[PDB]
Amino acid sequence: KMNPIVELFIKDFTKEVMEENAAIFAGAGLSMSVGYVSWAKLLEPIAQEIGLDVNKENDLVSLAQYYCNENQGNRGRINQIILDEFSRKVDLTENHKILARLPIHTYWTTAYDRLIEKALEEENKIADVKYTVKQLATTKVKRDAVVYKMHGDVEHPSEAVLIKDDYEKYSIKMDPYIKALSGDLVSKTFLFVGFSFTDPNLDYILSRVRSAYERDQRRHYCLIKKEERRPDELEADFEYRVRKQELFISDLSRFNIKTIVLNNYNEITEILQRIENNIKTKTVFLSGSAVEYNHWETEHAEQFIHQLSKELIRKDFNIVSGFGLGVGSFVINGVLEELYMGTIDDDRLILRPFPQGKKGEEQWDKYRRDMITRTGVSIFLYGNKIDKGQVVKAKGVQSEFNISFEQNNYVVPVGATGYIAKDLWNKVNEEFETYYPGADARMKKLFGELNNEALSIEELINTIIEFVEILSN
Amino acid sequence: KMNPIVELFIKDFTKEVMEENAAIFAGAGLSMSVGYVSWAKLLEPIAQEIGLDVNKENDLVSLAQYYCNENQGNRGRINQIILDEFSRKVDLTENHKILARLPIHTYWTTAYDRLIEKALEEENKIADVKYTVKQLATTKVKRDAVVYKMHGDVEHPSEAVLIKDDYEKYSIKMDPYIKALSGDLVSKTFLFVGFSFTDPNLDYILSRVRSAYERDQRRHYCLIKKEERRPDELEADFEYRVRKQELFISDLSRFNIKTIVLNNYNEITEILQRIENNIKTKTVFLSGSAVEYNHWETEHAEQFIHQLSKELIRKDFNIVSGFGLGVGSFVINGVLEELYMGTIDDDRLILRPFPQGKKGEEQWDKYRRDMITRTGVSIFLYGNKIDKGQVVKAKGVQSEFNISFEQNNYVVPVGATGYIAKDLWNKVNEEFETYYPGADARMKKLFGELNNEALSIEELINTIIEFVEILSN
Ligand SMILES: O=P1(O)OC[C@H]2O[C@@H](O[C@H]3[C@@H](O)[C@H](n4cnc5c4ncn4ccnc54)O[C@@H]3COP(=O)(O)O1)[C@H](O)[C@@H]2O
Numbered sequence: 001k002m003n004p005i006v007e008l009f010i011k012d013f014t015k016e017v018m019e020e021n022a023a024i025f026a027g028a029g030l031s032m033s034v035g036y037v038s039w040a041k042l043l044e045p046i047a048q049e050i051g052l053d054v055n056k057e058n059d060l061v062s063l064a065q066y067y068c069n070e071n072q073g074n075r076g077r078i079n080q081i082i083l084d085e086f087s088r089k090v091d092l093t094e095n096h097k098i099l100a101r102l103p104i105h106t107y108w109t110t111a112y113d114r115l116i117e118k119a120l121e122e123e124n125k126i127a128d129v130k131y132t133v134k135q136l137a138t139t140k141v142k143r144d145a146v147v148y149k150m151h152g153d154v155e156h157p158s159e160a161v162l163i164k165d166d167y168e169k170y171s172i173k174m175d176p177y178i179k180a181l182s183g184d185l186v187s188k189t190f191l192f193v194g195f196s197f198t199d200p201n202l203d204y205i206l207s208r209v210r211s212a213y214e215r216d217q218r219r220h221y222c223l224i225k226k227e228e229r230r231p232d233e234l235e236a237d238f239e240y241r242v243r244k245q246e247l248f249i250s251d252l253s254r255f256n257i258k259t260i261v262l263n264n265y266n267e268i269t270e271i272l273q274r275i276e277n278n279i280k281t282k283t284v285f286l287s288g289s290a291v292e293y294n295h296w297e298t299e300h301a302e303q304f305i306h307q308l309s310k311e312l313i314r315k316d317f318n319i320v321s322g323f324g325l326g327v328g329s330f331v332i333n334g335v336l337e338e339l340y341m342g343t344i345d346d347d348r349l350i351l352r353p354f355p356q357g358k359k360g361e362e363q364w365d366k367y368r369r370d371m372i373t374r375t376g377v378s379i380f381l382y383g384n385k386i387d388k389g390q391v392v393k394a395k396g397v398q399s400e401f402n403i404s405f406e407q408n409n410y411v412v413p414v415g416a417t418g419y420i421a422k423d424l425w426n427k428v429n430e431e432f433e434t435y436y437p438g439a440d441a442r443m444k445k446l447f448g449e450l451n452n453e454a455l456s457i458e459e460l461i462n463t464i465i466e467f468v469e470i471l472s473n
Numbered sequence: 474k475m476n477p478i479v480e481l482f483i484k485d486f487t488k489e490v491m492e493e494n495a496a497i498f499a500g501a502g503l504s505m506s507v508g509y510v511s512w513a514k515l516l517e518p519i520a521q522e523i524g525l526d527v528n529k530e531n532d533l534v535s536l537a538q539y540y541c542n543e544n545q546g547n548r549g550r551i552n553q554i555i556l557d558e559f560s561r562k563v564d565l566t567e568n569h570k571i572l573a574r575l576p577i578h579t580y581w582t583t584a585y586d587r588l589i590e591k592a593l594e595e596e597n598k599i600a601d602v603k604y605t606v607k608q609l610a611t612t613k614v615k616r617d618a619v620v621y622k623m624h625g626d627v628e629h630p631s632e633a634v635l636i637k638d639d640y641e642k643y644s645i646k647m648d649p650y651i652k653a654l655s656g657d658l659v660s661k662t663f664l665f666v667g668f669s670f671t672d673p674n675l676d677y678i679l680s681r682v683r684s685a686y687e688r689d690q691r692r693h694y695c696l697i698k699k700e701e702r703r704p705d706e707l708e709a710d711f712e713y714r715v716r717k718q719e720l721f722i723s724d725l726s727r728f729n730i731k732t733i734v735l736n737n738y739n740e741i742t743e744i745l746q747r748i749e750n751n752i753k754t755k756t757v758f759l760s761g762s763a764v765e766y767n768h769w770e771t772e773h774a775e776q777f778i779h780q781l782s783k784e785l786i787r788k789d790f791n792i793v794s795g796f797g798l799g800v801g802s803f804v805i806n807g808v809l810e811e812l813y814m815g816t817i818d819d820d821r822l823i824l825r826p827f828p829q830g831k832k833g834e835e836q837w838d839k840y841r842r843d844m845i846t847r848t849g850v851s852i853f854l855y856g857n858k859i860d861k862g863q864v865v866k867a868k869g870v871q872s873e874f875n876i877s878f879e880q881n882n883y884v885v886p887v888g889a890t891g892y893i894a895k896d897l898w899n900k901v902n903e904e905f906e907t908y909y910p911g912a913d914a915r916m917k918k919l920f921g922e923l924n925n926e927a928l929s930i931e932e933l934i935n936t937i938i939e940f941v942e943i944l945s946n
């Protein structure tokens with residue numbers, strides 16, 4: 001768990017992303033942990049050539065403009081520097097991979113590198129990268145996300161926005177990008193990551209949006225790390241910097257941009273992981289097959305499964321089922337009862353009955369893996385089939401459990417149902433920290449209660465629902 | 474009379490202009506006598522601002538380029554300077570007026586002022602001024618001459634070729650003008666006036682034409698003033714400058730451009746006046762009316778007039794006649810005999826019979842003035858009409874003589890024919906210097922012989938022809 005402000009932001013932004021109305025605004029700071037050297041370090045020889053010192057300079061745009069002025073406006077050196085630096089092959093950080101995995105269809109970047117594009121490519125996602133006005137007129141077919149590199153690309157250094165001339169001519173040359181960013185800011189919920197909010201173009205666009213929409217501006221989010229006490233600095237200077245940052249954050253809130261203050265930069269990764277987990281765990285994989293329903297009678301167990309599926313649908317969960325013999329019909333009935341109040345939404349219930357025959361069993365493993373990949377939580381019930389006239393614990397449920405563990409999915413074996421479910425519950429309780437690291441007391445109590453045969457249908461269903469909810473929320 | 478080289482050049486260039494295959498290339502030096510201050514004087518504050526001295530500088534293009542470099546490439550100051558200087562209202566010099574009066578249809582100028590355009594306008598000539606690539610695609614209807622301002626216009630200072638950047642980008646931006654000038658240099662006979670041949674664009678174009686045509690380049694002419702001994706300079710430095718100028722002229726001959734060395738800049742005006750006189754005097758106004766042909770018989774005088782007109786046509790003269798009673802038919806017969814050897818060319822014989830009646834006499838004066846304006850030499854014969862049955866000296870011939878004198882036309886009254894012609898000859902001999910200033914001994918002898926009644930038809934005709942030829946040639 002994190003700070004209550006962080007928890008509220010995580011809930012709100014997960015809600016925004018699940019509606020596919022969220023955009024990510026990534027600054028250069030999101031790529032500073034990857035391995036690219038700092039822009040000030042690159043400009044250090046540039047500053048030394050005009051007799052200045054990059055460490056004593058804070059406005060690097062004016063520094064680059066001075067360098068260009070000293071060379072009759074020529075940018076060849078700076079173009080070569082940025083091409084040499086930001087085109088290097090660097091391993092992607094976890095933040096880029098998580099952002100690629102999230103269902104985010106809009107990225108706006110002020111960085112010249114192609115880390116977002118590579119992260120989207122490695123997720124088998126089609127990325128429509130735009131850094132030219134002409135490129136706005138063409139859309140890639142079946143694209144997953146669109147990346148607006150509003151400061152240019154690394155492979156086109158001459159069109160990168162680096163000097164004051166570029167910023168001054170941006171409003172004329174790149175006006176369609178300004179219009180697109182204004183439309184996104186008024187129509188989408190943005191998350192600013194790695195952005196210092198010192199960009200003149202972004203200040204201009206935000207001021208225009210504020211002038212247009214007054215107090216009815218859309219709420220956006222930013223992630224900013226708190227000020228850290230430098231070794232040379234004194235306590236008074238640190239407190240002054242903290243107050244300055246507070247005034248900065250309250251003025252960004254003038255643009256209806258709420259700032260989340262983070263202790264360190266790894267909290268960005270933690271927040272992204274939490275959002276990804278909240279999105280992924282909303283889909284539950286219901287597994288099991290039952291000819292004999294352990295201690296419970298047939299009708300009682302059927303009603304239990306029906307009401308469990310109805311509660312899962314009611315709690316805004318998407319059920320994926322393999323249509324196991326003896327369990328599939330009743331989860332289908334529960335979903336139908338919950339939804340027919342109507343049509344079957346494709347997202348709420350995904351049914352994947354296994355092909356029957358010799359041909360089907362060849363691809364059964366890939367079918368099972370594809371079915372499980374859609375989910376983030378696996379729920380196992382019973383696990384008994386009939387082979388030679390006798391009830392024998394099934395083997396498909398074990399494969400399903402193995403696949404779920406290999407995909408880092410949460411496993412919720414209900415031991416009260418018995419058979420392979422009870423075996424899996426015993427296995428999980430044998431090594432609880434391996435499957436649920438850092439579990440709370442309530443989570444342990446719910447997991448232990450999952451193997452209670454004295455619970456009624458309602459009590460067991462409520463225990464399962466609460467366990468799945470604390471896993472997801 | 475001038476130097477034999479100058480006389481040969483005058484003959485050849487008059488021949489070229491009369492064929493309407495001659496072009497004029499005017500440099501800035503042609504406008505330096507009008508009143509515009511020198512370009513070095515304008516750049517003197519410009520040179521002082523960058524710490525240089527315009528007097529110590531010879532390449533003013535590099536000086537302007539240095540000034541622009543010191544101001545981040547801005548040309549506003551130089552544009553304002555040229556607009557303020559070369560757009561002033563200055564009275565046209567005689568050279569521009571003479572060039573406008575000449576039948577020259579092509580001007581190429583490196584000057585930004587509009588003196589050529591104003592000179593063409595004041596002659597009621599339509600001038601098609603071109604200084605933009607687009608303007609080459611449109612032609613003025615019924616234009617008399619086309620002016621290519623290849624270095625830009627004064628009213629568009631930002632497009633003037635002044636700095637090294639303009640010269641370096643001229644070959645790309647103004648390539649159609651380069652092609653047009655190459656075509657004119659290979660298809661027309663140029664006269665370079667006021668041009669120092671230190672222009673990089675002209676050097677490039679001439680080098681390209683030379684590379685294309687080897688020793689078969691078309692001959693062109695230039696007018697260059699000889700070096701003058703400066704008061705501070707010594708004899709050795711003056712001789713060195715003379716030798717340097719001689720080497721400069723031979724190099725120009727490398728481009729098949731023959732240079733006429735002039736003692737002073739007024740010799741340009743003298744040469745232009747001589748060419749204009751040679752062109753204008755080739756048209757002779759034949760005047761007269763005769764009922765009684767003085768001492769000669771009717772048939773003898775008719776044969777004399779016929780052979781005189783035949784000789785005038787044979788000597789490449791264009792006859793303009795008013796179709797006077799008793800003279801017009803026989804000059805017409807002479808022209809027909811000379812030409813039918815065939816059709817009547819409109820230039821060789823212009824016939825302007827006077828309208829008969831009260832309506833005609835109202836416009837008779839303007840008709841006579843328009844008829845005489847086409848000519849440069851007036852020849853008067855006889856001048857006797859019949860009013861009340863008696864031979865009375867005519868009055869139209871006197872008006873024709875007055876109009877010819879008012880237009881500065883040469884008058885050749887033949888006193889042997891008598892009547893108004895004899896009266897006019899006596900009047901001219903009364904004040905010979907007024908009508909023929911600076912006349913030679915041969916001219917005086919011919920004028921005196923013009924009033925000899927002892928001459929035969931052939932002798933009198935030869936005297937008239939020789940007098941008219943020494944007037945023209
Ligand atoms: O029980 P298990 O071991 O694992 C159970 C899991 O598997 C999947 O459902 C089973 C099974 O109910 C279904 N099935 C239905 N009818 C027959 C049949 N399979 C073989 N038959 C021979 C004759 N009639 C049948 O075929 C799936 C594959 O077979 P297994 O994976 O071996 O089944 C679910 O997702 C369930 O979670």
Ligand SMILES: O=P1(O)OC[C@H]2O[C@@H](O[C@H]3[C@@H](O)[C@H](n4cnc5c4ncn4ccnc54)O[C@@H]3COP(=O)(O)O1)[C@H](O)[C@@H]2O
Nearest residue numbers: 759760761762794795796797798827857858867868869870
């Ligand atoms: O002789 P002049 O004084 O001057 C002579 C000069 O003039 C022009 O030719 C005269 C004249 O030959 C012609 N003309 C012909 N027939 C008649 C007549 N004019 C009056 N008529 C009344 C009855 N029939 C006539 O009308 C031109 C105008 O009359 P004027 O100028 O008075 O003639 C030439 O260019 C000639 O050089």
